[PDB]
RNA sequence: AAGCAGCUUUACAGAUCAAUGGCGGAGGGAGGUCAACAUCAAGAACUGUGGGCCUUUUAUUGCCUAUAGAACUUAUAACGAACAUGGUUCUUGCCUUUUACCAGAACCAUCCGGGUGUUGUCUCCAUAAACAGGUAAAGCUGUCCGUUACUGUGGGCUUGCCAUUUUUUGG
């Protein structure tokens, strides 16, 4: 019923934490009810670069922390 | 006006109603919105000309 | 409306305890926790449970995947109880 | 250890209660609030981990659980 | 907001290549177009190819893609 | 003899809450919102913090059954002898209360009824400069008048937040005997006229932004509240939103349906009459007319409250406010409301930079707090201060700094301080203090030990480091709204009494803060103040309460300040630096009345009003009403300040009758120099007094303008009024909608 | 009959209700509690003997403490008693030479704002400051108007998602916005102490002072000398009376 | 205007001479 | 807010006709121009219980805390939505001395009365309420007696309802 309020945390180079004790860097470019994460692509976890937009179901995601200080 | 208050006063009443009406549950001009608001402040003198 | 909905943006400010599926133990202030409990930390401390031990400035959790979440003591005496 | 013919979680209210959990962990204490998730908020919540015996236990207090992490619940006595 | 949903409506209009990672799948990666759409993540992909991944190319045809697995959608 | 204050501890009116629980989370900065609750002359904000008590706290003792049931309005943040026998409120008196949302997250609110008497709006400034958000409490039957404009465009001018608790609603459905559909348009003209005087912002009971009352029956609602308590069942629950922002509106609804355009055959009524006040006026109307055994049945059927067997042999006012207070059955959507209208990063990194100067930020561990006024509270005399940054406790040693000096000390900043012990601190309540050892960021508490080393306002810090006071903000002296205008003129009856009578006004210029005590040359004390009732009530304190002497105090006087008109005829040079002398520009003077480097000066002035260029580029300063224009630079700027401190001791003592000089721009065509400053300051008040005097003199008289709410055929007889008293003019004749009432804004002088 | 048919069975009592219970704790009569017909049949009824002076702000000058500040300041008002001056009062400072005279300081003035106006004040009572401004209308058109009607005095006012269908409003079951006694109801609300309630105490026959409404409020009109004189008397006794609290 | 309680003129409701429905003086003296 | 599950209730159909356990009972209701005792002008101000702390011996004072209660009047402050009278002293008037006065103040009083609590008495209407200990008072307690503690019909609601990411229909 709740939408996510992260209006003010747009275009942040997010840690993201997933399945698998992974990491995927993003920033915030959009999201939605669902929060489904629109992220441009970055050095993703001896280290790769794949995608360029990734859209993220949200239960993949563990956590994530925003690294834009 | 005040002829019609005093003998057909139930009528003016009326009036008076279908004023307010078109008034306000119409979208009336501006010059009649202007008729509708002289007409009000005679009511409320009850024509002092 | 869920009663530990609202006791978790009853406990919003204090220094809370968040265990994951994961084991992932932070513990902060909390900023966020919607009705769907989307929960924002500051001043994040956080404990692996393999030892590893890490500070960060802003974290944001999606609730989908949270074990439990230890309020402080504060809480107990009021005001959502009587 | 006894109960009385109790019909649902609400009238058993702030009893002592051990929680089995899908990670291997037993809450035991008392309770302060539920949900339709069955989401306890334990009252004096001791977490115990049996890592492979020893039972590590855990001071917590308060503790708001969400409910899909929990099994079943058992009612041991009364408060106080 | 720039939507995922017209994210995804994006995707329809590129069709750039794509790699996704799954949800609790480990070895698998699903490589190639973004067609479909849904109000959930229902969508289609033909000529798919599973690539495991460094951490070969096994024979794959088509996929509906019932988004129950999903960790990326990407192009 | 002069307050109602509970001084004991066990006397203090126990909570529903927890106090030691509200400490406990006043910790956190984000939690605690401060409420200064302004209005116009008695709006109901006084009696709307009695909804608030009565529903914080278990048994109030100053409730009496006059009270407890509901006839006498308990007025209870009034607690001056004043307050008691005026019927105002005369100072900021406020409570600290937990408040729960609808989704019963409980915050601190620090509320602050600012007295809401024209006259007394100094301290309603205090009020705006000491709140996050502002319940602008307005009148129905009264409308937006032009104290509410004021009240809404100075909460804009502090970055304050704005929420509206439309007051008054039995005054609709019972003083004027109006129909839902008069009633719901008189609502839509008071609501229109909102949207109009706020910049780009909307207000509607579709948001969280317009709070619904009438304070004396128990009651307030916002049309969230009301879905939330009784259309939650009939709805299922996903659908409460998108019906919530269809109430308000040309919505109408039928059976299931909504068109924003009305039925055939049907012609009923719009969505917010229907599901709104259709029910409210059935609730007014039945509980004052129906029988008592249906009314039962109505409100258990309906609106799921029992009446007890004490609540049916009530009174109709008392039986119908504790209807109310059964229906609307607390405040918790006032307080939703407030949670939903303030955040905190979007609003209060701007209102802590125009009430100081707009920096980047201050390290949390110095402290930073503003004292907005010394109270004479119960007891001793307290200081209101909110804490922006740090964090106070008993026996901390704190610096003061009065604000009058801080923006010199700003200069010295741009680039030695009183520092008085905290005694003790409380919360302000309400006729309680609450001894609190610690408080916190965003809390407005009450220290005693302040209240020496300043006048007015303060700005009260602890610095650890060096580098640290660096970076430090200080606090503007506070703009107080109106300017200080009447005036009497005071001397003690017997001159032995002197010395008393002059701490007395110390107490005054600490406690009242808008008034402002100049003693002149004879022994006399003007004192000004921002009206009438203001003055009336500073002399009941002077002789009842601090001097307790008897006083001679003049007639009604005013400011007459001095200015000019025409062209100086005359650029006579004086030794003991020849400047003539121009009339400022009616725009230009009422643009440098609202108080609006170099080259953005020189473009402004180029751009807008027609300057010169050499006009422009050669400026000394600016005293408020009154320019310096120049016309050998080392010569110039060697006395540059002396100069200018010489200029503003010659227009704040003008030459006729030592009065202010405002509205004259003085243009120093040349000067003839050779232990130097001794003569310059002299030498430049005379040349500024024979630049006034070449030109014609005026002398200005300050012209209230007046708020007049009279019933429309007692109209002429205000133009009597207007036309008796000379100087006096009508300028706007405003039909009030929906009353018998006309609200004149003329104007009269002082 | 069928105008006054509540209150006709028991008005002209010796004593009106001593017999029955529902209305009067009992028969010895020290309790009274009303059905509002009963109560709007006694407020119509005894028109000549109320106040229809229901505003509160209509006494603005002829307060208690109006009269207690004219009293203390040796000073008249036109419809208010004079007494004594309670201090006898004898001789730079405020001289005509200082003064400057635009308005002249009416003693209306000197009573309602009692500290600017007066040197030298004592034993002044702070004055009540007026009430809002009441905005009552007074439905007075022979019985012909609703209770909730837009008087003739009032300015005008110049300016998919589906539900279920049995989803009603609140209250939807009645019809009536007002009912046969909401016209007499509110015109009860709205009227000053004893009728505005519909339970109480019994206060004796000597201590219902029923003329006492008539000197408490301005003269009517072109009343001759003696009867200004008594009004001026009565107000003169009741503020000796409440100056003394025995 | 006129009363009322009665219709008649001259007087007000409070000075009316008939129950609140819902001549010659001695003079010359 | 139709229904079902649950809980509670009375009319009950039922297990014992036990030992239990809840509720209710261990001498009524309405009142009365009935009186008796309190109590009613104040740190906005009240008591109950308990702890702790200070005198040169812990006594009568006075505080800090914990909880349970504050009936009656009180804010345009007052038991009374009304209002008299008397005394003393001072200051005015009438004056021809006092009483009787004019009329203001200050401090006191006296009268018509009033509220609330408890006790008792009286009137009207009714009617396992049995035994034992005490106080200034009560089912206060012990023994004890009805519906009845284990189901179903009939009422009330304190609740829930009428797989597709964030819990309950699978990592
Ligand atoms: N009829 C009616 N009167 C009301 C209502 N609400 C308040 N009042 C009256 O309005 C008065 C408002 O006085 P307060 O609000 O207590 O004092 P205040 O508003 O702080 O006064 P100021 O500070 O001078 O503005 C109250 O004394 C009430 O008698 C209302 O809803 N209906
Ligand atoms: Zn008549």
């Not at chain 6, 009824?113 to 809401?116: H, T």
């Not at chain 7, 002209?12 to 001593?18: G, I, K």
């Given at each position: 019923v709740s939408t996510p309020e992260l209006k003010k945390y747009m275009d942040k180079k997010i840690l993201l934490n997933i399945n698998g004790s992974r990491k995927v860097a993003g920033i915030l470019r959009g999201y939605d009810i669902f929060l489904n994460v629109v992220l441009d692509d970055a050095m993703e976890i001896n280290n790769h670069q794949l995608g360029l937009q990734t859209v993220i179901r949200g239960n993949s995601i563990i956590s994530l922390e925003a690294l834009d200080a | 006006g005040w002829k019609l208050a005093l003998v057909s006063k139930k009528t003016h009443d009326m009036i008076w109603e279908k004023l307010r009406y078109i008034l306000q549950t119409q979208e009336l001009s501006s010059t009649l919105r202007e008729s509708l608001e002289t007409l009000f402040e005679i009511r409320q003198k009850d024509y002092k000309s | 409306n869920g009663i530990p909905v609202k006791l978790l943006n009853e406990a919003q400010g204090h220094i809370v305890s968040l265990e994951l599926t994961t084991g992932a133990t932070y513990r902060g202030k909390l900023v966020e926790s919607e009705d769907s409990m989307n929960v924002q930390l500051r001043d994040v401390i956080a404990t692996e449970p393999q030892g590893a031990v890490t500070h960060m400035d802003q974290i944001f959790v999606r609730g989908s995947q949270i074990k439990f979440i230890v309020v402080p003591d504060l809480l107990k005496n009021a005001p959502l109880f009587k | 250890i006894q109960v009385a013919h109790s019909s649902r979680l609400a009238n058993l209210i702030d009893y002592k209660l051990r929680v089995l959990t899908q990670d291997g962990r037993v809450y035991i204490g008392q309770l302060m609030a539920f949900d339709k998730h069955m989401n306890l908020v334990l009252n004096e919540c001791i977490e115990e981990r049996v890592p492979k015996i020893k039972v590590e236990k855990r001071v917590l207090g308060l503790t708001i659980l969400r409910g899909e992490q929990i099994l079943s619940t058992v009612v041991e006595d009364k408060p106080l | 907001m720039v939507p995922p949903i017209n994210c995804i409506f994006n995707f329809l209009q590129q069709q750039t290549p794509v790699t996704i990672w799954l949800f609790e799948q480990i070895g698998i990666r699903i490589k190639g177009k973004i067609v479909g759409f849904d109000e959930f993540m229902n969508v289609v992909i033909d000529e798919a190819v599973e690539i495991p991944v460094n951490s070969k190319g096994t024979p794959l045809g088509k996929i509906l893609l019932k988004g129950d697995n999903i960790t990326l959608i990407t192009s | 003899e002069h307050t109602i204050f509970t001084q004991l501890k066990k006397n203090i009116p126990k909570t529903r809450y927890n106090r030691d629980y509200m400490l406990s989370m006043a910790n956190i900065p984000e939690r605690i919102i401060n409420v200064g609750v302004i209005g116009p002359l008695h709006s109901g904000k006084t009696s709307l913090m009695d909804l608030l008590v009565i529903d914080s706290h278990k048994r109030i003792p100053d409730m009496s059954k006059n009270v407890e049931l509901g006839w006498k309005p308990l007025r209870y943040l009034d607690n001056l002898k004043q307050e008691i026998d005026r019927g105002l409120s005369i100072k900021l008196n406020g409570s600290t209360l937990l408040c729960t949302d609808l989704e019963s997250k409980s915050r601190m609110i620090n509320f602050l009824?600012?007295?809401?008497h024209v006259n007394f709006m100094d301290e309603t400034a205090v009020a705006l400069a000491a709140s996050d958000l502002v319940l602008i409490v307005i009148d129905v039957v009264e409308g937006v008048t032009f104290v509410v404009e004021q009240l809404i465009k100075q909460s804009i001018k502090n970055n304050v937040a704005m929420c509206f608790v439309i007051n008054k609603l039995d005054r609709l459905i019972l003083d004027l005997k109006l129909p839902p559909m008069d009633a719901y348009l008189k609502l839509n003209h008071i609501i229109a006229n909102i949207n109009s005087f706020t910049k780009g912002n909307v207000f509607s009971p579709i948001d969280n932004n317009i709070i619904f009352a009438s304070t004396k029956l128990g009651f307030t609602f916002t049309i969230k509240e009301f879905v939330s308590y009784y259309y939650a069942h009939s709805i299922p629950s996903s659908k409460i939103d998108d019906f919530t922002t269809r109430l308000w509106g040309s919505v109408y609804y039928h059976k299931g349906n909504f068109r924003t355009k009305p039925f055939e055959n049907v012609e009923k009524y719009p969505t917010f009459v229907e599901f709104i006040l259709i029910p409210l006026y059935k609730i007014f109307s039945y509980a004052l007319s129906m029988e008592k055994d249906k009314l039962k049945n109505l409100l258990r059927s309906n609106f799921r409250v029992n009446l007890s067997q004490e609540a049916l042999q009530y009174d109709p006012q008392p039986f119908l406010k504790h209807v109310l207070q059964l229906i609307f059955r607390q405040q918790t959507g006032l307080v939703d409301a407030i949670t939903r209208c303030y955040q905190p990063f979007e609003l209060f990194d701007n209102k802590t930079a125009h009430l100081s100067i707009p920096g980047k930020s201050t390290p949390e561990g110095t402290l930073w707090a503003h004292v907005l006024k010394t109270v004479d509270y119960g007891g001793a005399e307290w200081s209101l201060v909110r804490i922006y940054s740090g964090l106070l406790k008993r026996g901390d040693t704190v610096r003061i700094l009065d604000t009058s000096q801080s923006e010199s000390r700003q200069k010295r900043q741009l680039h030695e301080t009183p520092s008085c012990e905290v005694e003790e601190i409380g919360l302000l309540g309400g006729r309680y203090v609450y001894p609190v050892h610690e408080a916190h960021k965003g809390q407005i508490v009450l220290i005693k030990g302040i209240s020496s080393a300043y006048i007015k306002s303060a700005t009260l810090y602890s610095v650890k480091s060096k580098e640290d006071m660096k970076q430090l903000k200080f606090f503007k002296p506070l703009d107080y709204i109106t300017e200080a205008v009447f005036k009497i003129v005071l001397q003690p009856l017997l001159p032995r009494e002197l010395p008393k009578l002059l701490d007395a006004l110390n107490k005054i210029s600490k406690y009242y803060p808008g008034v402002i005590i100049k003693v002149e040359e004879s022994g006399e004390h003007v004192i000004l103040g921002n009206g009438e009732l203001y003055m009336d009530c500073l002399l009941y304190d002077l002789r009842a309460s601090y001097a307790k002497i008897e006083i001679k105090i003049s007639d009604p006087l005013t400011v007459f300040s001095e200015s000019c008109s025409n062209e100086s005829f005359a650029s006579i040079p004086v030794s003991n630096i020849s400047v003539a002398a121009e009339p400022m520009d009616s725009k230009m003077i009422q643009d440098l009345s609202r108080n609006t480097n170099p080259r953005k000066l020189s473009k402004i002035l180029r751009t807008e009003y027609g300057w010169d260029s050499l006009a422009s580029r050669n400026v000394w300063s600016f005293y408020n009403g009154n320019v310096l224009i120049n016309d050998s630079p080392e010569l110039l700027s060697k006395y540059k300040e002396q100069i200018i401190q010489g200029f503003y001791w010659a227009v704040k003592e003008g030459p006729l009758a030592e009065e202010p000089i405002y509205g004259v721009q003085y243009k120093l065509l040349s000067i003839s120099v050779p232990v130097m400053k001794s003569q310059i300051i002299p030498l430049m008040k005379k040349a500024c007094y024979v630049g006034l005097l070449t030109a014609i003199p005026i002398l200005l008289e300050p012209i209230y303008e007046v708020d007049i709410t009279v019933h429309a055929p007692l109209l002429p007889i205000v133009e009597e009024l207007m036309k008796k008293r000379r100087g006096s003019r009508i300028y706007k004749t405003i039909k009030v909608a929906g009353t018998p009432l006309l609200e004149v804004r003329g104007q009269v002088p002082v | 009959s069928q105008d006054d048919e509540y209150v006709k069975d028991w008005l002209?009592?010796?004593?009106?209700?001593?017999?029955?219970?529902k209305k009067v704790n009992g028969t010895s009569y020290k309790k009274w509690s009303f059905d509002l017909p009963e109560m709007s049949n006694l407020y119509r009824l005894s028109t000549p003997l109320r106040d229809e002076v229901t505003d509160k702000n209509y006494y603005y000058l002829f307060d208690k403490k109006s009269f207690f500040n004219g009293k203390a300041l040796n000073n008249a008002i036109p419809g208010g008693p004079k007494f004594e001056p309670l201090y006898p009062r004898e001789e730079e400072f405020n001289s005509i030479d200082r003064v400057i005279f635009r308005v002249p300081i009416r003693s209306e003035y000197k009573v309602a704002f009692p500290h600017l106006y007066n040197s030298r004040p004592r034993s002044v009572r702070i004055p009540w400051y007026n009430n809002p401004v009441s905005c009552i209308i007074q439905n007075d058109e022979e019985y012909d108007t609703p209770a909730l009607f837009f008087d003739p005095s009032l300015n005008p006012i110049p300016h998919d998602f589906t539900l279920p269908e049995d989803f009603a409003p609140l209250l939807a079951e009645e019809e009536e916005l007002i009912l046969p006694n909401t016209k007499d109801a509110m015109s009860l609300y709205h009227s000053p102490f004893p009728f505005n309630r519909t339970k109480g105490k019994m206060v004796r026959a000597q201590d219902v002072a029923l003329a006492k409404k008539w000197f408490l409020q301005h003269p009517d009109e072109e009343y001759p000398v003696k009867v200004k004189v008594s009004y001026q008397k009565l107000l003169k006794n009741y503020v000796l009376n409440e100056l003394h609290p025995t | 205007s006129f009363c009322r309680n009665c219709g008649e003129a001259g007087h007000k409701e409070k000075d009316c001479m008939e129950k609140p429905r819902k001549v010659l003086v001695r003079a010359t003296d």
């Open positions: - | - | - | - | - | 009824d600012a007295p809401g | 002209y009592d010796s004593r009106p209700l001593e017999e029955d219970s | -």
